[PDB]
Amino acid sequence: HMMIKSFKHKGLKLLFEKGVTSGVPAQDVDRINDRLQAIDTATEIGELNRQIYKLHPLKGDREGYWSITVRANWRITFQFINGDAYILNYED
């Protein structure tokens, strides 16, 4: 499959699955949806390495997780394995 498999963030889940926007900032709806489309489409992590995304692996206790920037301090974080993305969260 190689797709998004699970969401930690309920807002992301609602947007992704039903197009319901109440769980994310209104002005970020398309920006977040585009990034979700990217994460869902990528088959390997390198495909997410766009400058605007500021792709980097997290360290310490969240070793194994990755982060992409949505806007400013806000980011989407996830585990990425075999093209599958797990525990999508929207944070910071």
Binding site: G19, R31, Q37, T41, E47, R50, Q51, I52
Partner: protein, 92 residues
């Protein structure tokens, strides 16, 4: 479940350019294609082609394969239920 709204990659690129402060014209010059071609791409009126995917990756990051997968997945989502394969014989 699959994503509720899947965008044409040209539309996604339009948003990214906007966020980056890059005009369609300036983008067109950088990747070496005509401004008309870019304008049509950005409005989702024309397909992200393989040669476009190579130039776009050089400018926006990621890989040509990724950009093409966005286009092909989008195209397949649009064609869903619009092609009746019920009368087609599966050989064997």
């Amino acid at each position: 479940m699959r994503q509720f709204k899947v965008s044409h990659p040209g539309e996604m690129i339009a948003r990214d350019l906007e966020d980056m402060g890059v005009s369609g014209r300036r983008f067109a010059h950088n990747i070496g294609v005509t401004p008309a071609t870019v304008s049509r791409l950005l409005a989702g009126k024309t397909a992200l082609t393989p040669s476009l995917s190579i130039r776009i990756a050089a400018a926006l990051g990621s890989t040509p394969e990724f950009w093409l997968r966005l286009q092909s997945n989008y195209d397949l989502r649009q064609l869903e239920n619009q092609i009746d394969t019920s009368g087609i014989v599966l050989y064997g």
